[PDB]
Amino acid sequence: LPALKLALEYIVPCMNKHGICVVDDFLGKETGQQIGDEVRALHDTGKFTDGQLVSQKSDSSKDIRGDKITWIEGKEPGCETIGLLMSSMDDLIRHCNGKLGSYKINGRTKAMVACYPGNGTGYVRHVDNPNGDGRCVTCIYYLNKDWDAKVSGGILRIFPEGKAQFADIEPKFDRLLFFWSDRRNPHEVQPAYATRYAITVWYFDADERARAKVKYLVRVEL
Ligand SMILES: Cc1cc(NC(=O)CCC(=O)O)nc(C)c1Br
Ligand SMILES: [Fe+3]
C-alpha cells in the first residue's frame, strides 16, 4: 500500500480505537531481507552492545546478558536500507499528522535496533514513557524470517490499560507495530529462544516534548 492509504484507512482509525496497530508486509520481502542483512552485518561486525545485564553472578565469566542495542541514525555506511525504513516510517507518520489522538508529531529519536540473542532472555514489563518525556508513539519494525513463537518465543505482550486481556504480538518478518508510548501500553518481551531483531523509533509530540524540556532542562551565558 501507499503510505497515505495505509495511514488514513488503517493506522489512524486503529490507533485511535485500540492504541495498538499491526501492519503486515510493510516493505515486502526484498527490502525486508535487505534490512535483515544490514542488521545482521552490524551484529556480525560487533556494532551492538554486549546486552543488558540480566543476572549478575558472584563470578563474571558466567554473567548472563539479554537484549543488545545499537543506535542507528540511518546515514551510516552499511545502514542505507535501515535509513530507508526510517524514512518510510516517517512518511507514514507524516501522512497521519493531526489525526493520531490530538498529538502534533514534530520529531523522533534515532532508531534503536535491538537483538535478543536467543538465550532465553526477554524484557521485563515496563512503560516506554512513564514520566511525560515527550514520546507519544512507539514504532517497531520486525525482521525475523519465518518466526515461530510457539518454538522460539519472543512475543511482545502488551497489557492495554484497563483491560483484563493481553495483546500478544509475534515479532514476525516485515511486520510494523505502533502503540501509544505512555502508560496506556505496559508491555514485556517474553523469553526469546532464537535470535530476535527489531528496530524501534519513538515519535515526539510537540507540546509534551516542549514542556518536558521545561521541567527537565540548555544553559546560555549571562
Ligand atoms: C531498552 C528498552 C527496550 C524496549 N524494548 C521493548 O519494549 C521491546 C519491543 C520489542 O522488541 O518487541 N523498550 C524500552 C523503553 C527500553 Br529503555
Ligand atoms: Fe518498550
Residue numbers in the entry: 188 to 404, 410 to 414
Study authors write:
Following from the observation that specific heteroaromatic inhibitors with glycine side chains induce PHD2 crystallization in the P63 form, we investigated the selectivity of small-molecule induced PHD2 crystallization. We observed that crystallization of nPHD2 is induced by succinamic acid derivatives (SCAs), 4a, 4b, 7f. and 30a. This is interesting because none of these SCAs are potent PHD2 inhibitors or stabilizers (as observed by MS, NMR and thermal shift analyses) in solution. The nPHD2.SCA complex structures manifest a similar ligand binding mode to that observed in the reported nPHD2.FG2216/P63 structures, i.e. like FG2216 and related compounds, the SCAs coordinate the active site metal ion via their heteroaromatic ring nitrogen and side chain amide carbonyl oxygen. The chelate ring size may affect the stability of the protein-complex and possibly its binding/inhibition potential. Although biophysical (MS, NMR) analyses suggest that SCAs form only a weak complex with monomeric nPHD2, the clear Fo-Fc difference density for the SCAs suggests that intermolecular interactions of SCAs notably with the C-terminus of a threefold symmetry related neighbour in the P63 form may both stabilize the ligand binding in the crystal lattice and help promote crystallization. Unexpectedly, the work with small molecule ligands led to the observation that the ability to induce formation of the homotrimeic crystal form does not correlate with either their active site ligand binding efficiency or inhibitory potency. Compounds from both the FG2216 and SCA series enable nPHD2 crystallization with approximately equal efficiency, yet FG2216 (and related compounds) are significantly more potent inhibitors than the SCAs under the tested assay conditions.
The degradation of HIFα subunits is promoted by post-translational hydroxylation of prolyl-residues located in its N/C-terminal oxygen dependent degradation domains (NODD and CODD). These dioxygen-sensitive reactions are catalysed by 2-oxoglutarate (2OG) and Fe(II) dependent prolyl hydroxylases (PHD 1–3 in humans).
